[PDB]
Amino acid sequence: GDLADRFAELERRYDARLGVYVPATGTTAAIEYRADERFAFCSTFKAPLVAAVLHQNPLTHLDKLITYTSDDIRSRSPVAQQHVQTGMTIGQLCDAAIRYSDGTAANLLLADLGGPGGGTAAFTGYLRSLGDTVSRLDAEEPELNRDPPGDERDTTTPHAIALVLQQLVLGNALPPDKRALLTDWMARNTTGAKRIRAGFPADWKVIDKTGTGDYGRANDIAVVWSPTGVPYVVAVMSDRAGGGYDAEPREALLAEAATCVAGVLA
């Protein structure tokens, strides 16, 4: 119908593949467009990664110091760059991973979660513990952003990652104290202003984690709250694989998809 046609026009205009999922609520039907097609996580995985590390350990574990060297920085790492000599705490790594999408921070958290070699498997296992049987993480940073189109490695679906974020932020996957850390870090993020946030009116609260990658990949996952406090979860994923590995991502595509959703939820 109308919404499907609107989303299709976005795909034509941006020369992109778009995926959208918004779970049903008691008064709204699910919004679904390519919701069960796989799309690369890119940095969206960092949100559930932090949740996994929070869940697996006591609060005092956030103060554990992790050391590393400049040879460990193999991805865009705006925070970890500055702390090679000192190390960073698990807590500082979580902050960096969410708020700066720091790649080395995410790799170090993976290693904390699953050991050397076992991180991506352990991360995927955490998603399994949340009832996500579809998503998979296979490589670390930066390779996870760079898989060829069609490859199932390092992919989720709008549907799957929406339900994950829903459990983490709106459900009881984490105890409230841990849930609030995750939520707060997402609230203070420095990369999502032009994505789902840009599709919702200013009196709606939005917290999000972005992802960006090769093949014009641009994703955003969010929880939003209406002016009266009614929550919804919004996943928007995109790629422009037709343009090749260096295709330009289009944040505006996500903002527009979000505007369509906001129009329905208003």
SS3 per residue for the chain: CHHHHHHHHHHHHHCCEEEEEECCCCCCCCEEECCCCCEECHHHHHHHHHHHHHHHCCHHHHHCEECCCHHHCCCCCCCHHHHCCCCEEHHHHHHHHHHCCCHHHHHHHHHHHHCCCCHHHHHHHHHHHCCCCCCCCCCCCCHHHCCCCCCCCCEECHHHHHHHHHHHHCCCCCCHHHHHHHHHHHHCCCCCCCCHHHHCCCCCEEEEEEEEECCCEEEEEEEEECCCCCEEEEEEEEECHHHCCCCCCCHHHHHHHHHHHHHHHC
69 is in an annotated binding site: no
Interhelix angle 46-56/90-99, nearest 10 degrees: 160
| Number of structural domains the chain divides into | 1
Instruction: Kindly list the catalytic residues.
Output: 43, 141
Q: Which residues contact 53 (CB under 8 A, 6 or more apart)?
A: 61, 90, 94, 109, 112, 113
**Gyration radius of the chain over CA positions:** 17
* Residue whose pair of structure tokens reads 């992919």 in the numeric block: 155
Is 211 annotated in some ligand binding site? yes
CB 155 within 8 A of CB 136: yes
> Under a CB-based contact definition with an 8 Å cutoff, are residues 107 and 141 in contact?
yes
Cβ atoms 242, 21 nearer than 8 A: no
CATH number for the domain that contains residue 66 = 3.40.710.10
Alpha carbons within 13 angstroms on the beta-carbon side of residue 36 total: 2
Residue listed under structure tokens 């329905």: 264
What is the C-alpha separation between 30 and 22, in angstroms, rounded? 5
Q: Is the dihedral of CA 240, 132, 50, 222 positive or negative?
A: positive
Q: What Å resolution does this PDB entry report? A: 1.8
Which is it for the CA torsion 230, 31, 245, 128, positive or negative? positive
Q: Counting beta carbons within 10 angstroms of the beta carbon of residue 74, is it exposed (0 to 12), middle (13 to 18) or buried (19 or more)? A: middle
d(Cα 181, Cα 76) in Å, to the nearest integer? 24
Is 120 assigned a ligand-binding role in the annotation? no
The whole domain housing 119 covers: 2-265
Quote the crossing angle between the two packed helices 176-187 and 46-56, to the nearest 10°: 150
Q: What CA–CA distance (Å, rounded) separates 184 from 7?
A: 31
**Does the annotation place 191 within a ligand binding site?**
no
User: In terms of C-beta density within 10 A (0-12 exposed, 13-18 middle, 19 or more buried), how is residue 129 classed?
Assistant: exposed
- Which residue, among 11, 13, 46, 77, has the nearest Cα to 237 in the 3D structure? 11
Residue 252 has phi, psi (to 5 degrees) of -60, -30
User: How many other CB atoms are found less than 10 A from the CB of residue 224?
Assistant: 23
Place of tokens 């998979």: 136
Structure solved via:
X-ray
